[PDB]
Design an enzyme around this catalytic site. Structure first.
Site, PDB file in Angstrom:
ATOM      1  N   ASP A  37      41.370  31.941  52.129  1.00 44.72           N
ATOM      2  CA  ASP A  37      42.740  31.790  51.662  1.00 44.72           C
ATOM      3  C   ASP A  37      43.348  33.117  51.176  1.00 44.72           C
ATOM      4  O   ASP A  37      44.100  33.136  50.224  1.00 44.72           O
ATOM      5  CB  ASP A  37      42.885  30.652  50.641  1.00 44.72           C
ATOM      6  CG  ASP A  37      44.324  30.124  50.519  1.00 44.72           C
ATOM      7  OD1 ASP A  37      44.551  29.293  49.636  1.00 44.72           O
ATOM      8  OD2 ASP A  37      45.202  30.525  51.295  1.00 44.72           O
TER       9      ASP A  37
ATOM     10  N   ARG B 111      49.752  35.284  47.325  1.00 44.63           N
ATOM     11  CA  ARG B 111      49.688  34.307  46.248  1.00 44.63           C
ATOM     12  C   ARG B 111      48.288  34.287  45.594  1.00 44.63           C
ATOM     13  O   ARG B 111      48.136  33.774  44.498  1.00 44.63           O
ATOM     14  CB  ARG B 111      50.064  32.915  46.726  1.00 44.63           C
ATOM     15  CG  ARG B 111      49.201  32.401  47.851  1.00 44.63           C
ATOM     16  CD  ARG B 111      49.606  31.026  48.342  1.00 44.63           C
ATOM     17  NE  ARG B 111      48.775  30.689  49.476  1.00 44.63           N
ATOM     18  CZ  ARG B 111      49.024  31.076  50.717  1.00 44.63           C
ATOM     19  NH1 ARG B 111      50.105  31.770  50.992  1.00 44.63           N
ATOM     20  NH2 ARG B 111      48.189  30.766  51.680  1.00 44.63           N
ATOM     21  N   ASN B 112      47.279  34.803  46.300  1.00 46.93           N
ATOM     22  CA  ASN B 112      45.921  34.880  45.779  1.00 46.93           C
ATOM     23  C   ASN B 112      45.511  36.325  45.502  1.00 46.93           C
ATOM     24  O   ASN B 112      44.344  36.687  45.613  1.00 46.93           O
ATOM     25  CB  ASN B 112      44.950  34.207  46.749  1.00 46.93           C
ATOM     26  CG  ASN B 112      44.906  32.695  46.576  1.00 46.93           C
ATOM     27  OD1 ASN B 112      45.060  32.183  45.476  1.00 46.93           O
ATOM     28  ND2 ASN B 112      44.681  31.973  47.668  1.00 46.93           N
TER      29      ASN B 112
ATOM     30  N   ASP C  19      41.181  33.340  43.922  1.00 47.35           N
ATOM     31  CA  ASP C  19      41.322  32.126  44.708  1.00 47.35           C
ATOM     32  C   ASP C  19      41.659  30.996  43.720  1.00 47.35           C
ATOM     33  O   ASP C  19      40.795  30.556  43.004  1.00 47.35           O
ATOM     34  CB  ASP C  19      40.045  31.834  45.484  1.00 47.35           C
ATOM     35  CG  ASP C  19      40.169  30.633  46.398  1.00 47.35           C
ATOM     36  OD1 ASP C  19      39.172  29.937  46.595  1.00 47.35           O
ATOM     37  OD2 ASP C  19      41.251  30.405  46.929  1.00 47.35           O
TER      38      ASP C  19
HETATM   39  C1  STI Z   1      40.138  31.760  35.533  1.00 46.38           C
HETATM   40  C2  STI Z   1      39.655  31.987  36.809  1.00 46.38           C
HETATM   41  C3  STI Z   1      38.584  31.240  37.237  1.00 46.38           C
HETATM   42  C4  STI Z   1      38.056  31.416  38.504  1.00 46.38           C
HETATM   43  C5  STI Z   1      38.593  32.324  39.395  1.00 46.38           C
HETATM   44  N1  STI Z   1      37.970  32.428  40.589  1.00 46.38           N
HETATM   45  C6  STI Z   1      38.426  33.166  41.614  1.00 46.38           C
HETATM   46  O1  STI Z   1      39.457  33.817  41.589  1.00 46.38           O
HETATM   47  C7  STI Z   1      37.610  33.193  42.763  1.00 46.38           C
HETATM   48  C8  STI Z   1      37.709  34.280  43.622  1.00 46.38           C
HETATM   49  C9  STI Z   1      36.933  34.389  44.775  1.00 46.38           C
HETATM   50  C10 STI Z   1      36.006  33.409  45.089  1.00 46.38           C
HETATM   51  C11 STI Z   1      35.218  33.536  46.250  1.00 46.38           C
HETATM   52  N2  STI Z   1      35.264  32.351  47.115  1.00 46.38           N
HETATM   53  C12 STI Z   1      34.361  32.436  48.273  1.00 46.38           C
HETATM   54  C13 STI Z   1      34.393  31.131  49.070  1.00 46.38           C
HETATM   55  N3  STI Z   1      35.770  30.823  49.476  1.00 46.38           N
HETATM   56  C14 STI Z   1      35.855  29.578  50.233  1.00 46.38           C
HETATM   57  C15 STI Z   1      36.657  30.751  48.312  1.00 46.38           C
HETATM   58  C16 STI Z   1      36.624  32.040  47.551  1.00 46.38           C
HETATM   59  C17 STI Z   1      35.880  32.329  44.222  1.00 46.38           C
HETATM   60  C18 STI Z   1      36.669  32.217  43.070  1.00 46.38           C
HETATM   61  C19 STI Z   1      39.683  33.085  38.955  1.00 46.38           C
HETATM   62  C20 STI Z   1      40.233  32.908  37.681  1.00 46.38           C
HETATM   63  N4  STI Z   1      41.260  33.614  37.183  1.00 46.38           N
HETATM   64  C21 STI Z   1      42.535  33.396  37.482  1.00 46.38           C
HETATM   65  N5  STI Z   1      42.886  32.533  38.429  1.00 46.38           N
HETATM   66  C22 STI Z   1      44.214  32.325  38.719  1.00 46.38           C
HETATM   67  C23 STI Z   1      45.170  33.031  38.025  1.00 46.38           C
HETATM   68  C24 STI Z   1      44.784  33.917  37.039  1.00 46.38           C
HETATM   69  C25 STI Z   1      45.750  34.641  36.345  1.00 46.38           C
HETATM   70  C26 STI Z   1      47.095  34.333  36.462  1.00 46.38           C
HETATM   71  C27 STI Z   1      48.035  35.085  35.768  1.00 46.38           C
HETATM   72  C28 STI Z   1      47.650  36.139  34.954  1.00 46.38           C
HETATM   73  N6  STI Z   1      46.305  36.449  34.846  1.00 46.38           N
HETATM   74  C29 STI Z   1      45.372  35.694  35.539  1.00 46.38           C
HETATM   75  N7  STI Z   1      43.482  34.080  36.807  1.00 46.38           N
END
Ligand code: STI
Length: 279
Positions: free
Chosen positions: A140, A144-145, A158
């Protein structure tokens, strides 16, 4: 790993940053999370009351992936988690500018400079390179991500359960789910193949978003059989307004019909570096 456990009493929860049907991300403050900054802003992901076991598993699975990937400057970084005597909480760093799409929209008038766009482009490739190096496929990747932190550091993220895919126009219904078709490689849409190579195609779409200052891909072109036919026929977008011709070439190379012909994230980082005045 219990090295990540953080007491719940040390976490203050604030306003919602993102929400979906079963999950949400909220602003927060953590006390004692860091020796250096004892009063630190953070982002916290958690389930909603409406969620079931399937979603709980997904959240836990996400946390595991995060604990396992090491840290990287260009990926939103894990700081801790709350996994005992309560619903699971995933705690990351907070990004001051929020998501890239909103940031780009807010800054059209200032346009933020072209060099900044190039840096964003370079940083995303580096973050993706890191994920690819860990054999992790995003699926994804889009503006937006992508979050932007203080100092204009891109942080790939994500939203997952924290995104309302059902009510977001960017996601199209397919087989009992919604997909961001305008960002997906053909082999993903039609043959259910997801690889680092399909991420590269999404990266090209992301670059189009960056150099249109948050425009919608395939503007005015709705997703239907005709759109699907055009993509399979080798149709690609025109150059966005703020892209240079070298930046456009990069996008085109990312949209090759054959996945093996797409450049690697490592290669993309080097090609973009050559466009930057700074070495
Ligand atoms: C709080 C949190 C918890 C979990 C995550 N996780 C991820 O961001 C993430 C990234 C990459 C992967 C890898 N993954 C591999 C497999 N495929 C299918 C999906 C992706 C997984 C999770 C982010 C966050 N943080 C987050 N998320 C959304 C918005 C914000 C945010 C928004 C505004 C201001 N500051 C922070 N912060």
């Amino acid at each position: 790993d219990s090295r990540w456990e953080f007491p719940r009493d040390g976490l203050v929860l604030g306003r919602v940053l993102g929400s979906g049907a079963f999950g949400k991300v909220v602003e927060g403050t953590a006390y004692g999370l860091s020796r250096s900054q004892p009063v630190m802003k953070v982002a916290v992901k958690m389930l909603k009351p409406t969620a079931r076991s399937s979603e709980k598993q997904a959240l836990m699975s996400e946390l595991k992936i995060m604990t396992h990937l090491g840290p990287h400057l260009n990926i939103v970084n894990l700081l801790g988690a709350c996994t005992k005597s309560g619903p699971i909480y995933i705690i990351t760093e907070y990004c001051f500018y929020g998501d890239l799409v909103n940031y780009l929209h807010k800054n059209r008038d200032s346009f933020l400079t072209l060099l900044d766009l190039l840096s964003f482009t370079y940083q995303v490739a580096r973050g993706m390179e890191f994920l690819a190096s860990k054999n992790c496929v995003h699926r994804d990747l889009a503006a937006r991500n992508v979050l932007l932190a203080q100092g204009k550091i891109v942080k790939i993220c994500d939203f997952g359960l924290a995104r309302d895919i059902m009510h977001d126009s960017n996601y199209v219904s397919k087989g009992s789910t919604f997909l961001p078709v305008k960002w997906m490689a053909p082999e993903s849409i039609f043959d259910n193949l997801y690889t680092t190579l399909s991420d590269v195609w999404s990266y090209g779409i992301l670059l189009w978003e960056i150099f249109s200052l948050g425009g919608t891909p395939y503007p005015g072109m709705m997703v239907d059989s005709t759109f699907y036919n055009k993509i399979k026929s080798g149709y690609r977008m025109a150059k966005p307004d703020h892209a240079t011709s070298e930046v456009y070439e990069i996008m085109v190379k990312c949209w090759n019909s054959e996945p093996e012909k797409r450049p690697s994230f490592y290669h993309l980082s080097e090609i973009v570096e050559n466009l930057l005045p700074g070495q």
